[PDB]
Amino acid sequence: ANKVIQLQKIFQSSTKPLWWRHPRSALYLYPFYAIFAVAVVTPLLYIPNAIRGIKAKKA
Amino acid sequence: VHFKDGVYENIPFKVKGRKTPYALSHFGFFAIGFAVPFVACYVQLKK
Amino acid sequence: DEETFEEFTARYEKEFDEAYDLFEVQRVLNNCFSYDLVPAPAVIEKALRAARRVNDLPTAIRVFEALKYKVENEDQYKAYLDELKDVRQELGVPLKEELFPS
Amino acid sequence: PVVKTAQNLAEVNGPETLIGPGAKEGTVPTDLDQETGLARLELLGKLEGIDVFDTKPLDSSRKGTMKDPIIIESYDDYRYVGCTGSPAGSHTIMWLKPTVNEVARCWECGSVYKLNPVGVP
Amino acid sequence: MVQRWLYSTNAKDIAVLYFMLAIFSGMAGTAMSLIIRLELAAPGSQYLHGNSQLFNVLVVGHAVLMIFFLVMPALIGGFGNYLLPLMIGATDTAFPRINNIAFWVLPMGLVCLVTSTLVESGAGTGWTVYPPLSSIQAHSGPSVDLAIFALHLTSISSLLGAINFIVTTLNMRTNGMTMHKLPLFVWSIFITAFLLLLSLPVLSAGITMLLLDRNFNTSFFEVSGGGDPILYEHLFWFFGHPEVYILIIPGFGIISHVVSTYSKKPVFGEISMVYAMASIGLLGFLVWSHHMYIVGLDADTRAYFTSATMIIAIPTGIKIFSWLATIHGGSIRLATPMLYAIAFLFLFTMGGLTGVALANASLDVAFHDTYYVVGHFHYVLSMGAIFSLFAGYYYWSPQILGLNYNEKLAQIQFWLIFIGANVIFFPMHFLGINGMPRRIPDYPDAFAGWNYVASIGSFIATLSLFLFIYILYDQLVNGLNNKVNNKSVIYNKAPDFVESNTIFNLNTVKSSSIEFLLTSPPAVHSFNTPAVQS
Amino acid sequence: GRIGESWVITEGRRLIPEIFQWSAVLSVCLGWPGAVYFFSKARKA
Amino acid sequence: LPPNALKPAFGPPDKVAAQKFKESLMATEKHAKDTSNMWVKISVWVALPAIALTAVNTYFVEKEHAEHREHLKHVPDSEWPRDYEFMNIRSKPFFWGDGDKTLFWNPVVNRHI
Amino acid sequence: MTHLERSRHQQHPFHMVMPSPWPIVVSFALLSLALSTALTMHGYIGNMNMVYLALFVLLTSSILWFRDIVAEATYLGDHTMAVRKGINLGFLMFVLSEVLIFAGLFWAYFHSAMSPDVTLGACWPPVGIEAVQPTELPLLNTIILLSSGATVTYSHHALIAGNRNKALSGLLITFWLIVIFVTCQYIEYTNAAFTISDGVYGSVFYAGTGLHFLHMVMLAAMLGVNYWRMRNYHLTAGHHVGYETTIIYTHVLDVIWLFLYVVFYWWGV
Ligand code: HEA
Ligand code: HEA
Numbered sequence A: 001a002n003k004v005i006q007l008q009k010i011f012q013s014s015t016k017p018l019w020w021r022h023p024r025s026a027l028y029l030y031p032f033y034a035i036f037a038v039a040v041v042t043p044l045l046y047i048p049n050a051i052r053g054i055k056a057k058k059a
Numbered sequence B: 001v002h003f004k005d006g007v008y009e010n011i012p013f014k015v016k017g018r019k020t021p022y023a024l025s026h027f028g029f030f031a032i033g034f035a036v037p038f039v040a041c042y043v044q045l046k047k
Numbered sequence C: 001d002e003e004t005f006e007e008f009t010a011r012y013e014k015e016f017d018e019a020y021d022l023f024e025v026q027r028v029l030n031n032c033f034s035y036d037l038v039p040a041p042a043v044i045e046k047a048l049r050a051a052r053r054v055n056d057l058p059t060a061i062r063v064f065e066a067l068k069y070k071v072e073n074e075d076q077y078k079a080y081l082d083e084l085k086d087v088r089q090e091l092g093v094p095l096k097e098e099l100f101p102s
Numbered sequence D: 001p002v003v004k005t006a007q008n009l010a011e012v013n014g015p016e017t018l019i020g021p022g023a024k025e026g027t028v029p030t031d032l033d034q035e036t037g038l039a040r041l042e043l044l045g046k047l048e049g050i051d052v053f054d055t056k057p058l059d060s061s062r063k064g065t066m067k068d069p070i071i072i073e074s075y076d077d078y079r080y081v082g083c084t085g086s087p088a089g090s091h092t093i094m095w096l097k098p099t100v101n102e103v104a105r106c107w108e109c110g111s112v113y114k115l116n117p118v119g120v121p
Numbered sequence E: 001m002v003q004r005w006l007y008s009t010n011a012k013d014i015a016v017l018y019f020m021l022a023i024f025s026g027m028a029g030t031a032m033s034l035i036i037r038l039e040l041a042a043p044g045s046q047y048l049h050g051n052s053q054l055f056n057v058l059v060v061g062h063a064v065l066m067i068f069f070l071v072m073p074a075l076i077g078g079f080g081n082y083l084l085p086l087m088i089g090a091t092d093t094a095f096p097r098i099n100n101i102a103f104w105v106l107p108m109g110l111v112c113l114v115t116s117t118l119v120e121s122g123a124g125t126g127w128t129v130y131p132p133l134s135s136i137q138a139h140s141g142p143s144v145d146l147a148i149f150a151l152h153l154t155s156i157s158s159l160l161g162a163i164n165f166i167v168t169t170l171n172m173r174t175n176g177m178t179m180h181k182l183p184l185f186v187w188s189i190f191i192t193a194f195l196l197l198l199s200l201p202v203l204s205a206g207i208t209m210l211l212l213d214r215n216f217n218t219s220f221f222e223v224s225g226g227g228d229p230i231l232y233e234h235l236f237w238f239f240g241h242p243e244v245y246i247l248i249i250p251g252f253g254i255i256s257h258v259v260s261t262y263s264k265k266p267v268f269g270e271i272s273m274v275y276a277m278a279s280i281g282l283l284g285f286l287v288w289s290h291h292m293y294i295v296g297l298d299a300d301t302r303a304y305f306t307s308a309t310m311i312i313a314i315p316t317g318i319k320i321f322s323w324l325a326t327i328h329g330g331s332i333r334l335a336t337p338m339l340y341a342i343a344f345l346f347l348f349t350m351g352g353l354t355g356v357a358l359a360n361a362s363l364d365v366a367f368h369d370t371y372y373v374v375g376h377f378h379y380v381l382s383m384g385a386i387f388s389l390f391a392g393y394y395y396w397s398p399q400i401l402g403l404n405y406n407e408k409l410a411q412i413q414f415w416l417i418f419i420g421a422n423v424i425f426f427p428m429h430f431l432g433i434n435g436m437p438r439r440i441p442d443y444p445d446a447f448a449g450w451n452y453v454a455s456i457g458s459f460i461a462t463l464s465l466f467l468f469i470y471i472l473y474d475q476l477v478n479g480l481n482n483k484v485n486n487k488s489v490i491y492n493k494a495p496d497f498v499e500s501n502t503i504f505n506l507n508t509v510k511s512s513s514i515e516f517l518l519t520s521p522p523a524v525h526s527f528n529t530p531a532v533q534s
Numbered sequence F: 001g002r003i004g005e006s007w008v009i010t011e012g013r014r015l016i017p018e019i020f021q022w023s024a025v026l027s028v029c030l031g032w033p034g035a036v037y038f039f040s041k042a043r044k045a
Numbered sequence G: 001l002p003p004n005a006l007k008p009a010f011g012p013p014d015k016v017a018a019q020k021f022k023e024s025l026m027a028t029e030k031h032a033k034d035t036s037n038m039w040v041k042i043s044v045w046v047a048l049p050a051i052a053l054t055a056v057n058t059y060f061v062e063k064e065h066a067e068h069r070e071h072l073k074h075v076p077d078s079e080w081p082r083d084y085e086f087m088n089i090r091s092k093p094f095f096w097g098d099g100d101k102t103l104f105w106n107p108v109v110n111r112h113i
Numbered sequence H: 001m002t003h004l005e006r007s008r009h010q011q012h013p014f015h016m017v018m019p020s021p022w023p024i025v026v027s028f029a030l031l032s033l034a035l036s037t038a039l040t041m042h043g044y045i046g047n048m049n050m051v052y053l054a055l056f057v058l059l060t061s062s063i064l065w066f067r068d069i070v071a072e073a074t075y076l077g078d079h080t081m082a083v084r085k086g087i088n089l090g091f092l093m094f095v096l097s098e099v100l101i102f103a104g105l106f107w108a109y110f111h112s113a114m115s116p117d118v119t120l121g122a123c124w125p126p127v128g129i130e131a132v133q134p135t136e137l138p139l140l141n142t143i144i145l146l147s148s149g150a151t152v153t154y155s156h157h158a159l160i161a162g163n164r165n166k167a168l169s170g171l172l173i174t175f176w177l178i179v180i181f182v183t184c185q186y187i188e189y190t191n192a193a194f195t196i197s198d199g200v201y202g203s204v205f206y207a208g209t210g211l212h213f214l215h216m217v218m219l220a221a222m223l224g225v226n227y228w229r230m231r232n233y234h235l236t237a238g239h240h241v242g243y244e245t246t247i248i249y250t251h252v253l254d255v256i257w258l259f260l261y262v263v264f265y266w267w268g269v
């Protein structure tokens, strides 16, 4: 169309990462994984901390 | 990517630095390898 | 396996003819010894002639040692004796009588 | 900045400077100047008689002796070429490491090779 | 390090990560199998006071780590993506993102298994996941689910690796190479990729079905509804039988390569080599139900399956004879890779012929699911995975990294590990042939001495492995001092016994693989001009 | 002219030491389990 | 006109391969167009009428006797077909869910719980 | 100049890719999904919204990679004949693995032809096990799916020939038929045939039909991505890396559906 060639020329002129298409989307998605997945994986081992230690020793 | 001579750059180690004289790294690798059997035995029973 | 000696023999002499230096001499001799074909006295004489052309006595010593020990061939000796004496006294490359008693 | 014809392969500067104008509605554009990527470098070449990544073997028949060693075209400092005898497959696969200053030989084949790069500043 | 390593997109720079994960996983798994053997030394709870579930879980972890997470990641990917693009001569394999996503999907499997062992639930139903023992009826908790996702991610990584192998070797192979002049290791990995592609989806489907049955309150293989686990055993063995060939064939390739480069003589019928490999790969599918003769199938079915097994055995014998032809009538330099290759040709062959003997339809009445089968596969796995990987490492390390190794240390390490492996695995045939069962932490009071000799052998093997990692350290820290002095061999192919040493300066290393002809490892995007063969 | 061998003489004088050595290696490799059997208290000795 | 010191990667000359590749491209395009045209013609000739006949008779047979499953939901547990050990066995204990010990609330498959 | 750059970028169809975080982030998404599911179905916390968001973000990352795999084919270009052949062969092997999945689904119950076993089934047809059979029930949709595939395969052939208003009409017809198919799939959401309580014979059929309901979603996603791209007119009738993928997919899915309709419908009845 009327923006493919200009876009390619500008991208070649400015050899930068992030591919220019979704900067706001990248800035939105970047902190979300750290906020969510880290805070949901921490309980997985934090909660069984008191549960851990079952020696079940018999003699 | 073409800025590496190709001598020690192929390994995530570093001779330069007094932080680890290639001993702490190997000690840590031994520790992480022995961790899984030792902790697996320890969590439910004695070593 | 029903392979004629004459064709490869003639190839060996003809390659020895245009031996510019010792590299082709070495490669041709190695290829000749590679087969089970025990070298004929004629090809060994041609090889020694090429070695004298290139002026490297160690090649002659090495090829003599190779002839002495290349294949068991049911431990034949007098054939080795003649094949060594004819080419020693044909022109003279005195080399065997020194490495042995050392 | 704008459309580039690139009808000739000796007038293109910048691999991405060419996109290839197409058509929105009507008929399909001709497969000459409407391709994104370096694919035109090979398609237009083979349309006009230029090939890419030739698979032609070197002069196997010629032994490449001292007088006339064979010539390989490679502008790089080093090269990976070899010999397999005068026919296609004669001996075990083998190849050399030619260099800019010195030469290399094929050992059992006796095929002496040489590195010939194009002149560079 | 994150900017180039943790965010890597280079096949060469990721093969070393493959190797590092392989060696770490191997050291951890050898430690845990050391434990497993250590509680097997004497009857009773010598070190595991009760809780046989822990023993079962450790067994499952050992088997799964060696099978899916140790060596298949090592020889398939790590050696494949470091040799195949390098031997082809292409600057870079197509889509290194595929290799990166294949690699980075490994470690969370390790953490999910370690936490699954950590929780009280545990996965103690064997590395085989036969129902209903792995469902909510018997084993609750997240251990089964974590193991299932681990195998799923490993399968996905394997599929991506096979994709990259196929695309690189078939789409942009170098001009000089053609169909009739292609080397052997790449043919091996190609056939391996084909078998992997035809084997992965059935496992994925069946294990997804088990997960859905455990979750959706249904049962397709469990009797709870009318299902029958015989179908699942069919599917699992249909996946499993190709897997051993997947892990073994690249070993064949590298062993053929080393015996060709060290005997100073060419291969014996490389066309015959690829014929044997392709026949094995295609014929592996005819015995989908040969591993369960105990089920009670018809006599005709058993006869056809045993005929298929004895047909399968023949190309392996052809390959062994081919190796013997390659070694016969040639000079031999008794270096350590030759030691590994000879140990292979002996012990792998003896184990394989024992397995062929067991491959009788009615002979599973004596060996199946006993210690005889563990003596069977421990042999061939150790020869074709441990020793194959050792041979490859000692055959490529001085060049792929530029660092040599202490030859005396290598020799003593080989001797130690060989004697340890022999003295460990040999008695278990005596164990099984009596008829003792499998997967029990405590055993009757008959074969205490054999377990004891197995345990001392295990200690020997782990001492050998410690020496090996010390060798790794010494190579990584003392390479330049070892090259200058006489501590190591710097030319694997000695000159022919006609050729002078001064002329040998320009004939350093010439063989049938380009990577030996390269200089010290250059920049990753090497090979500015593709190699061409005349 | 059939100098020396007579294949039999050299063939035997080479093989017989080699065959004896190989048989002894197998004997040791199968007697070490027998050595364990003897040394272990199999018969309360 | 970018510069070239000696050669602009001329490679093989403009030999007869150019028109051969052109002929290959047009042959492939013509084969695709002809196969599409003949497939369309044979589809509209015989394949489409036969497909329509199969569709209409399938609809007729589905509406004739395959609609009996509508009243299968309400059926007494006294005239079950002569089935066998395929069913009426212990099932997975119910821990998650609310609807009739199953994920989908369709109490129609069986009258035995 | 021209020769040197041609040789240095000719046999190198791989861009000098930036430190792409795609591998680590996608691996992290999969691991979070796995552990969260394990903790939710049977664990300590039964929250559902957070794992739903985990699945959502995993799908967003997948869509991002999937749109890049075709945007970089045209916006960045830098492709040759060899890489096109490789990508097509990759799609072919992917659909072959899907066909292997379908074959495993078929063999899950298709090996009981002459009843070789004794108990727990071994009776073809399963007399007595007569619930609301999922057989012949969706055939009213299978026949219209066959007709739609037949009428759109040649439309997509004319697409790849011309990529014109006829191609737009074919794409619109495909959108309509896939919308109809997803509508008729969701109409049998809960009560399609029955539930799984006893006698698992059609339950496996229901599961097999259900688990394949994502490939059509993937096809629709690719069609929509290509629609957006050609609305942007980045992709002309040139490097159509997605048009070839969709035509091969529609040329293999009709074949596999035909193979599915060969048996399991009129066999045993
Ligand atoms: C690579 C494959 C591999 C390796 C190395 C081993 C190594 C060992 N294995 Fe195991 N084993 C299996 C594969 C392997 N095993 C499989 C697939 C099963 C099936 C489970 C089942 O039947 O249910 C099994 C099961 C199994 C059992 C069955 C237990 C039971 O019945 O429940 C036992 C019993 O003692 C056992 C013992 C050992 C011992 C003592 C070693 C010791 O030899 C450990 C020392 C290791 C070796 C001597 C090899 C060196 C390994 C390395 C990693 C070196 C590291 C360096 C590099 C890799 C570069 N193994
Ligand atoms: C490295 C992996 C590996 C390799 C290479 C093999 C190699 C072979 N295996 Fe084995 N096998 C396993 C891994 C492997 N296996 C595992 C993990 C199990 C399961 C244990 C478990 O479940 O816990 C198993 C089990 C297994 C069983 C069932 C026993 C069981 O209950 O475990 C059988 C029997 O059919 C069998 C056969 C063979 C055969 C015939 C070969 C052959 O390919 C051997 C190849 C070698 C040759 C055959 C040498 C060439 C022979 C000749 C020189 C010709 C001489 C004879 C003729 C005249 C033809 N294997």
Ligand SMILES: [Cu+2]
Residues within 6 Å of the ligand: E241, E287, E290, E291
């Ligand atoms: Cu098998």
